[PDB]
RNA sequence: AAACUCCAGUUGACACAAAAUAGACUACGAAAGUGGCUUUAACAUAUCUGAACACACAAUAGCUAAGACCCAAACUGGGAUUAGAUACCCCACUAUGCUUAGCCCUAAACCUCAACAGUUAAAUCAACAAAACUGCUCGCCAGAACACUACGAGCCACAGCUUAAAACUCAAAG
């Protein structure tokens, strides 16, 4: 099952052919790893 | 194995930032790497003043690069980053998602230690 | 005892009701104890599962006029 | 101290004795000196509380076994 | 525990290291 | 014999073990907003497990992540980032009074 | 609004203005509270020396410099040389745990200067250089 | 030394891995693994080559093979780290513990003692 | 040096009350440990001596934290004698 | 007091040195020992005990050779104290502490409590300390001092380490 899941993801990996395209797309999006927590153990992601 | 390259580029325009990313990713493939993704964390202000290549930086762009590569390719890649002037700071760490977290049951209370001293009348 | 599992769940689902215990009175029956008698009596019928048997017990008390306010 | 009054009354009603106060050293082992040489010590001691106020055995439990007096205790 | 048995050995070693330096 | 005798059984009323706020969650060195919740607003000093309230296994993860983010250029050392000063307080420490 | 003990951040605009000036434009009073002396130096936001005073420059010598009287006397002399240049509000920056750590701050108030903030810049190394050996006195 | 293209011990057995992408076969090989995955394969070869029942690993024979693969690992680590005194003690103890295994094996089953000495290239030397 | 200035160990004065601010500042440094750390860093504390002090400070905390737990547990019996006279 | 006064303070640039908080945690390693970050390699044995005929390690100090040098610092010098002060206090600076390549192989190297297995009952138990015991094995000790010494032997050790006595003396030592 792990091999099958891996065989699907490999399609999305960057390659020398699509390297330039992926770079431009990355410069347009943003990934946010920031999130706080309360005393009740509840995640609070920022509204941005 | 699977690694993650925390890259801090210099505050540059889009044309120059794309040439550095491509220049940096082509170096990984030349060393036997298999790039997987390119995440952008956005341009922010550095927590402290960083000095690199005779330049005092106050801002930089944060980018992540998840990839697969052999163990011998890490040390050869750490040298390449040092030479690149556009890169303020770059470090490689083992990807945090390849470290399974053992399930936790809860906090176990610890009772006070007993029988530390003889039960004699001092 | 076997009925301690029942009491533990009642207190978790409902908890001690407005009715206050009277420990002086030897032949005193609390709301939870009343719930145990019905829960066990329905067990004699033949039901072999806790979830359904537990749910049916609460309904019987509500029919008898007992007040069962769940913690929720 | 909560039951000192109740016990002192019972002893008086049943024509018996009570000692609910601080037990001075030698009431039993050195009685003849405290009271007199012709004193008569108890033949039976009844402990309604075998502990003192510091959660330790009453000294009379040990002093009674020295004087060969049988004890009854709760 | 006292160090009276250590003080005897302390002077013995000191005088011996001082005698070797002299001879 | 008699049926009223007790039985050999485990405690039914026993309560589940308590958990830290971070139990079952992944601590990553890039989440500076979470890591700043366990440092002094004034000195940047890391708090202890008697202030954070975390367990031993998770207090070690926050520490290793803070020390890694500080030297990588993600988090400051001497002070807490002012941007995260208005975040929920989870630490049991009161300075002003 | 409420009051906060956290200073305004230059990146973020604030509503706290002292005599029509921002928190950043306020001059700074650097105090160096040592065990045997106490130096005071006032500067502007652009790092321009305005006034300098110390327990030694005021006449105190040897052990008499490590007291609160000489520190206060030095704070009054530094607040009288800076008040002639148009200084009213200052930001204090103490460095050291010497005797004249607080007494020097009083002399600044007794010279017509108002303290809006207090900053501690005491140098603590994270390890650093090995200090001198412990004394037997 | 197993080639780098060799698949991992776990993934070689699963069905359907014969026909997959080349990139997926390069991620499941020894090239993208650490040093401890190549040693799991070196041990597998010796068992099939030498031991009658590869599946049984608690037998005295397998323990010798498992330990002889560790000894070779320490010699490759000491050829680059000469001043690592810790791993130099694990080597000298592992060589002494294998000799104690070969002694008990030569005393019980001499037929297999010759097979292991030949397969692994070991020469039992009587102590002085 | 490389960090921003006037953001660390900085306290603002309320209504020109310098004393109350200084007490607050001196209380933040004390709770964080800087004050004591600065006093021990005046002279070099050798490892052997620093290991003797940490062990001393840790055994004192235990004792001081258990006695206080017993004082707050017995403070309930500080009331008047209910059986006055027996 | 001397010293310094091409000194001090603010700001900026700026390490072959040392590694706040976390740590009120008690983990790793045979011990020594190990508490900044990342990566690579990696932490013996499916019964135990077992080498003072061997092998491999072993804090600090120190020797040899070549480098580095912020700070600290034996030695030395100066100032002061003192009856004197070859010390305690102050200043300055050197070997040295660091790196690389070799040697040296010691410690209150002490948690002064050996390894494996097992027990909590009986006489629990001189005292103190960190409760009292069983089985098995190895190592070690037999009054004090002479003696961490002499001779002999071994060692990259040459004012050294290891092993280690005797004569005379005492009726105590502990
Ligand atoms: S309690 Fe489960 S992780 Fe802290
Ligand atoms: K010791
Ligand atoms: Mg003593
Ligand atoms: Mg002598
Ligand atoms: Mg052995
Ligand atoms: Mg030995
Ligand atoms: Mg050594
Ligand atoms: Mg050296
Ligand atoms: Mg110096
Ligand atoms: Mg002199
Ligand atoms: Mg030098
Ligand atoms: Mg040294
Ligand atoms: Mg030691
Ligand atoms: Mg010993
Ligand atoms: Mg042994
Ligand atoms: Mg003798
Ligand atoms: Mg010696
Ligand atoms: Mg000798
Ligand atoms: Mg000789």
């Amino acid at each position: 099952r792990e091999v099958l899941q891996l065989q699907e993801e490999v399609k999305n990996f960057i390659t020398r052919e699509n390297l330039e395209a992926r770079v431009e797309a990355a410069l347009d999006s943003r990934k946010n790893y920031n999130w706080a927590i309360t005393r009740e153990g509840l995640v609070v992601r920022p509204q941005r | 194995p699977r690694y993650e390259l925390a890259l801090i580029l210099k505050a540059m325009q889009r044309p120059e930032t794309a040439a550095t990313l491509k220049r940096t990713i082509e170096a990984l493939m030349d060393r036997g790497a298999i790039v997987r993704d390119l995440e952008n964390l956005g341009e922010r202000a550095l927590p402290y003043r960083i000095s690199a290549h005779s330049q005092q930086h106050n801002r930089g762009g944060y980018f992540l690069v998840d990839f697969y590569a052999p163990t011998a390719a890490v040390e050869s890649m750490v040298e390449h980053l040092s030479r690149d002037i556009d890169v303020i700071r770059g470090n490689i760490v083992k990807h945090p998602l390849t470290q399974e977290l053992k399930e936790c049951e809860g906090i176990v209370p610890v009772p006070l230690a007993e029988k530390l001293y003889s039960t004699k009348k001092r | 005892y076997h009925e301690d599992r029942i009491r533990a769940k009642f207190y978790s689902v409902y908890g001690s009701g407005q009715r206050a215990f009277d420990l002086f009175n030897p032949n005193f029956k609390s709301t939870c104890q009343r719930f145990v008698e019905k829960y066990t009596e329905l067990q004699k019928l033949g039901e072999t599962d806790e979830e359904k048997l537990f749910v049916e017990t609460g309904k019987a008390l509500l029919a008898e006029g007992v007040i069962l306010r769940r913690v929720g | 101290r909560q039951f000192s009054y109740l016990i002192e009354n019972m002893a008086r009603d049943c024509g018996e004795y009570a000692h609910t106060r601080y037990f001075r050293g030698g009431m039993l082992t050195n009685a003849r000196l405290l009271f007199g040489p012709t004193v008569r010590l108890p033949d039976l001691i009844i402990f309604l509380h075998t502990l003192n106020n510091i959660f330790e055995p009453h000294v009379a439990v040990r002093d009674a076994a020295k004087m060969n007096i049988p004890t009854v205790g709760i | 525990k006292n160090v009276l048995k250590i003080r005897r050995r302390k002077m013995n070693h000191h005088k011996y290291r001082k005698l070797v330096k002299k001879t | 014999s008699n049926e009223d005798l007790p039985i050999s059984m485990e405690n039914p009323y026993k309560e589940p073990l308590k958990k830290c706020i971070l139990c079952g969650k992944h601590v990553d060195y890039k989440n500076v907003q979470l890591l700043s919740q366990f440092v002094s607003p004034f000195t940047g000093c890391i708090y202890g497990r008697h202030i954070t309230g975390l367990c031993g296994k998770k207090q070690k993860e926050i520490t290793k992540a803070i020390k890694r983010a500080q030297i990588m250029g993600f988090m400051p050392v001497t002070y807490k980032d002012p941007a995260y000063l208005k975040d929920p307080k989870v630490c049991n420490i009161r300075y002003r009074e | 609004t409420k009051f906060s003990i956290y200073p305004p951040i230059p990146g973020e605009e604030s509503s706290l203005r002292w005599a029509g000036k921002k928190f950043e434009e306020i001059p700074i009073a650097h105090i160096k509270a040592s065990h045997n002396n106490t130096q005071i130096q006032v500067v502007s936001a652009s790092n321009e020396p305005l006034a300098f005073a110390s327990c030694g420059t005021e006449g105190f010598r040897n052990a008499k410099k490590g007291t609160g009287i000489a520190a206060q006397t030095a704070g009054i002399a530094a607040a009288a040389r800076a008040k002639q240049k148009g200084v009213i509000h200052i930001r204090v920056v103490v460095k050291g745990l010497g005797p004249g750590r607080l007494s020097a701050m009083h002399g600044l108030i007794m010279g017509g200067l108002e303290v809006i903030s207090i900053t501690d810049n005491t140098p603590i190394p994270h390890x650093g250089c090995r200090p001198r050996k412990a004394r037997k006195l | 030394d197993p080639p780098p293209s060799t698949l991992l011990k776990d993934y070689q057995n699963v069905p359907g891995i014969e026909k997959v992408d080349d990139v997926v076969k390069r991620l499941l090989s020894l090239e993208m693994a650490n040093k401890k995955e190549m040693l799991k394969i070196k041990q597998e070869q010796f068992m099939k080559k030498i031991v009658a029942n590869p599946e049984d690993t608690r037998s005295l024979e397998a323990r010798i093979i498992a330990l002889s693969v560790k000894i070779r690992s320490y010699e490759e680590h000491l050829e680059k780290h000469r001043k690592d005194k810790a791993h130099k003690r694990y080597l000298l103890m592992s060589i002494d513990q294998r000799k104690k295994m070969l002694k008990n094996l030569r005393n019980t089953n001499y037929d297999v003692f010759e097979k292991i000495c030949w397969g692994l290239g070991i020469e039992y030397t009587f102590p002085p | 040096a490389k960090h921003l200035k006037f953001i660390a160990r900085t306290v603002m004065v309320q209504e020109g009350n310098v004393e109350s601010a200084y007490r607050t500042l001196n209380r933040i440094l004390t709770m964080d440990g800087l004050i004591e750390d600065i006093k021990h860093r005046r002279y070099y504390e050798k490892p052997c001596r620093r290991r003797q002090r940490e062990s001393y400070e840790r055994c004192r905390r235990i004792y001081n934290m258990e006695m206080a737990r017993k004082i707050n547990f017995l403070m309930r019996k500080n009331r008047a004698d209910p059986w006055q006279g027996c």
Side-chain angles (χ1 to χ4, degrees), chain G residues 30 32 39 41 43 47 52 62 95 125-133 135-137:
Chain G
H30 293 277
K32 185 185 176 186
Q39 313 185 25
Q41 180 183 3
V43 297
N47 190 48
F52 183 92
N62 307 340
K95 172 185 296 181
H126 295 177
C129 312
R130 175 162 171 159
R132 50 153 304 164
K133 66 196 187 74
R135 287 170 79 169
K136 320 194 177 81
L137 184 54

Side-chain angles (χ1 to χ4, degrees), chain B residues 4-8 39 41 44 46-48 50 62 64 89 91-94 96-97 99 101-109, chain F residues 17-20 23-30 32 53-55 57-58 61 68-77 79 84:
Chain B
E4 178 182 339
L5 169 62
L7 195 67
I8 305 182
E39 297 175 285
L41 305 183
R44 67 190 67 162
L46 307 180
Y48 39 75
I50 298 182
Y62 287 65
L64 283 180
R89 181 170 300 191
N91 291 337
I92 301 180
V93 304
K94 302 197 302 290
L97 293 185
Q99 292 184 16
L101 295 183
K102 189 178 187 174
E103 282 188 310
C104 182
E105 303 171 23
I107 295 177
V108 297
Chain F
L17 299 174
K18 295 183 182 183
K19 298 183 168 183
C20 56
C23 190
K25 298 178 178 57
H26 173 74
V27 175
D28 186 0
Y29 70 93
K30 291 161 294 189
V32 176
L54 300 177
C55 63
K57 184 177 180 179
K58 225 61 177 180
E61 281 184 44
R68 179 191 280 201
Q70 283 171 354
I71 196 53
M72 283 184 180
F74 282 82
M75 182 181 181
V77 177
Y79 52 74
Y84 311 118

Side-chain angles (χ1 to χ4, degrees), chain H residues 39-56:
Chain H
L39 297 181
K40 289 175 59 182
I41 288 186
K42 281 191 178 181
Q43 175 176 354
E44 182 191 20
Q45 301 178 344
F46 285 122
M47 299 280 284
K48 299 175 187 169
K49 167 189 183 181
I50 297 169
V51 176
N53 181 18
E55 295 178 351
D56 184 1

Side-chain angles (χ1 to χ4, degrees), chain G residues 10-79:
Chain G
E12 294 177 350
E13 279 300 342
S14 77
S15 59
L16 346 167
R17 268 42 161 166
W18 300 261
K21 276 186 173 184
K22 292 180 179 183
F23 182 81
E24 297 82 357
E25 314 176 35
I26 311 290
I28 314 175
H30 293 277
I31 303 173
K32 185 185 176 186
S34 304
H35 300 104
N36 306 320
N37 207 9
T38 296
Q39 313 185 25
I40 310 181
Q41 180 183 3
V42 181
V43 297
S44 59
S46 57
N47 190 48
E48 304 177 21
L50 302 179
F52 183 92
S54 81
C55 301
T57 59
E58 294 313 311
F60 294 87
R61 302 302 177 191
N62 307 340
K64 293 179 179 179
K65 291 183 311 179
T67 51
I69 292 300
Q72 176 176 20
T73 303
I76 293 173

Side-chain angles (χ1 to χ4, degrees), chain F residues 26-44:
Chain F
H26 173 74
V27 175
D28 186 0
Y29 70 93
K30 291 161 294 189
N31 184 4
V32 176
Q33 176 168 358
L34 172 70
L35 300 179
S36 298
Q37 285 182 299
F38 306 99
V39 302
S40 182
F42 301 95
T43 60

